[PDB]
Amino acid sequence: EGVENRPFPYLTVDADLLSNLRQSAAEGLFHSFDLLVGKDAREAGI
Amino acid sequence: EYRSTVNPWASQLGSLGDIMYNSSYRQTAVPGLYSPCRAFFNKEELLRNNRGLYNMVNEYSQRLGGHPATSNTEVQFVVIAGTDVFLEQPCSFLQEAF
Amino acid sequence: MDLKVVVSLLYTDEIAKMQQRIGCILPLASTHGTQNVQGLGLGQVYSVPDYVSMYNYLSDCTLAVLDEVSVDSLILTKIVPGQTYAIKNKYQPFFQWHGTGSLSVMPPVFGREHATVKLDIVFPMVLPTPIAEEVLQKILLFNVYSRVVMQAPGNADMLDVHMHLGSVSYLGHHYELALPEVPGPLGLALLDNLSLYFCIMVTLLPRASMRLVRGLNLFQEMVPDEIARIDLDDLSVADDLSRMRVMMTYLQSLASLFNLGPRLATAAYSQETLTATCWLR
Amino acid sequence: KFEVLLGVYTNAIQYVRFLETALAVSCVNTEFKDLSRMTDGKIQFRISVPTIAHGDGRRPSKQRTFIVVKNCHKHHISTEMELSMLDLEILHSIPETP
Amino acid sequence: KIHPGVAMTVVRTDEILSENILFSSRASTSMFIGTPNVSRREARVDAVTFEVHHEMASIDTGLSYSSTMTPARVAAITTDMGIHTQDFFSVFPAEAFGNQQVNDYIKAKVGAQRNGTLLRDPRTYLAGMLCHGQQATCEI
Amino acid sequence: RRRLQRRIAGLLPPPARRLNISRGSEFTRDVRGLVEEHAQASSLSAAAVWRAGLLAPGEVAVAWSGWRPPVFGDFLIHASSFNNAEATGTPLFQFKQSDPFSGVDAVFTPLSLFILMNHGRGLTRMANLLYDSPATLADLVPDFGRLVADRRFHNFITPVGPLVENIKSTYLNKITTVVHGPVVSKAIPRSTVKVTVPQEAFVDLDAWLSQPCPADARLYVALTYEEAGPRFTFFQSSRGHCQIMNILRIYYSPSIMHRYAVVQPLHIEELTFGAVACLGTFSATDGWRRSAFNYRGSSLPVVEIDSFYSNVSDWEVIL
16 A cells, blocks of 8 residues: 565565564554555556 | 443433534634543544554653643643643543543 | 945934935936936925825835944945845835735825934835835825814814724724824815815716717616716816816826825835835836 | 953864764664665565374464565654854855964 | 541642653664754744754664663652642632532632632643642642 | 946846757757756755745855745645645635634635535535535634635635645644745655646636647636535636626636526626636646546546746636
């Protein structure tokens, strides 16, 4: 909802930013996010 | 759960409290006074925070989210300037008086 | 550009009286570099005074907002229609200016001693345009309602014409006007012929309002009453022509004077420092 | 009998830098010389979530991946200083007098 | 001082001037400090007026909250937690009773129209628009 | 006598009004000095300030050309009265409030001023979409229906020129309007602002008549009192004010009959039928190019006056 999904080279940081994420996206801390479960969790077509 | 209200003269939708205190606050009102009951009686404020928890925590600190009083005056007025007026307020966050 | 005007002539009280009026404007005789004492405004025209000659002199010659006062010189800057200026309301009839209001330079009706510096530098009253037309109505109708009670005291009550004509209320500010109670008959005062110009305008008007609808529709004949419409129809043609010419001149000149003349236009007033960013318009 | 003056003092306005104070620990800075050109900034996180394999019969969440972006803010500040024209007509001249 | 048939329940509000503690973790946001720009914005014949500009653009580089702000100590309380009930004759000055002589009797028996100088927030009013501190407006 | 020669040596040279060129492809130093205009903003360092010529007295020159700088108006307004998603070049209308020391102003977009005209009885979709509550606009004016009835609404609204800069403030918004002068934007990259007036309110008067081609076609506003409420029509005309009042009486002659027919002027203050004022001059060749104003889901057609010179005047009554 305001997010693009391109096959970017994603820099691999080491932060613990998984903690309280699936509950934080449900309440709406993030203004715009895309949840990709299953086949959508892919480095998309160029 | 053993009763519906402790008074029906203000808790009802069209009661006496919703006669005299449930008024939609506007910045250009002709009295301009500050009523501390308007945080408890506004239907537009009791349903203002029905959005999710983190999106209430976000709008709690980011702005003067609802009904502040003017400090350093003689009588309490509701603010219109808001430039140097920084204050936080839990009474609109949780809707309970002490 | 060069905009300063250095008029050469003060002792300590006259200097200190000039310092209280160091920001307000005054009219200049000529748009030249070095001028003399007489060249400053309203000393040769307001010393019996009338509003029409002061208005003609004020719209005729150029104006200048003064800057500094020396022991012998008065360094003052003329105002041109090009660029913008900063003026201050340091006038003794105090009217609160607001932002983006047309300021009018009207000659002093509130007395000579209110706005003068007797060294005689007579400054003009710079007050906003709705207050200008309101005070002009409330001095003009006061002169009319004083002449009719010097003529016939049973017509108008003096206590009736001082409740309305002694109070101006623009934007909540209530102002009281210093009005002459004894103007004296046969003129000899301020506003004495402008109140007499209006009466010649009003008298020849129903003789001329019928003259155009006879000469030249149905909508224009319903809003007046019938009696003023069908009034005479028979007058001497040369006398009617003379009355028409005098009526037209005293219509056009009076209307150009009811336009307030030299009209400044402020943008940002600041009552913390009493300055208004104005320009000529 | 004279009027001595025993000194004419003034305060030295010490410079304050943002990178000299310790508020700059909480944010990493960058001199971006053309910021007014920028109309929208964006930073994009991709959080590939792991999952526990369960032996009890439950609806199993597959390989999830959150794509949350964060849009930049824009803060434009401006004060207003004044300078007399008499302090500029001398600045744009050349003097031959002490 | 006899009881009426009703029982009023007052509500006040109290300003508590606190002294807060702002924590903010290291390298939370990532600001983009632009360059300062001066712009002439008022050129009158007496004094030209410059308006310098500056633009920054912060962006948070974390996902959860990375700052917190608790009060530490009460510096003072500013409102007298007392009894100043606001009057509805200032809040609703258009409402009135039938008779005028009962109106100016009720407004004389209660403390009606005690002050009318300020009907809006004082800060908004320009320059030159009660000996105690800010009075907490009670509300029955 | 040589010091005075050195003084006049800086005061002699006028701006180059003409320049005999040989080729345009060479782009010489002289034609570059002819075309170059000094900027009103630069980076805050001594080199860029000295090269922009900001410290020069009266005008900008690195160290009279027809270019006068604009004078800006700064208005602290209620943030609920103004919508921040309006266009940059839109004319605003300050209401002279009745309270003596109010520090908050009351400005009005022609969309914001429209829902004063409606409530009490296209644009109305957009004017009701921008302002979800007209009751917070109806109490900015203390007595709107009273002031309209005795025909004193025109001398209480003064136009304050088009908007240029609007900082999005939360409680007490501050807006910047060019109250006189060249309507040019204030921004770090300087760009052009176009005066946006809504199309169903803007009525052209050169085409309503339908060989002398003048240079400047002035823009007029017209607060006129009708039976359905007052109206705000924006007139574009190439002729002077003495011509615009006569042609406005000619244009509104049926509406005077309508207002005399549907109500009767039983009082003396109902005689005035509106008043007009000049909002400023723009070029007649490229003016009033139509565009759109796209809000969230609806778009009203808008007319966009480019290269506007705001110069407002007092109201001239139409009768």
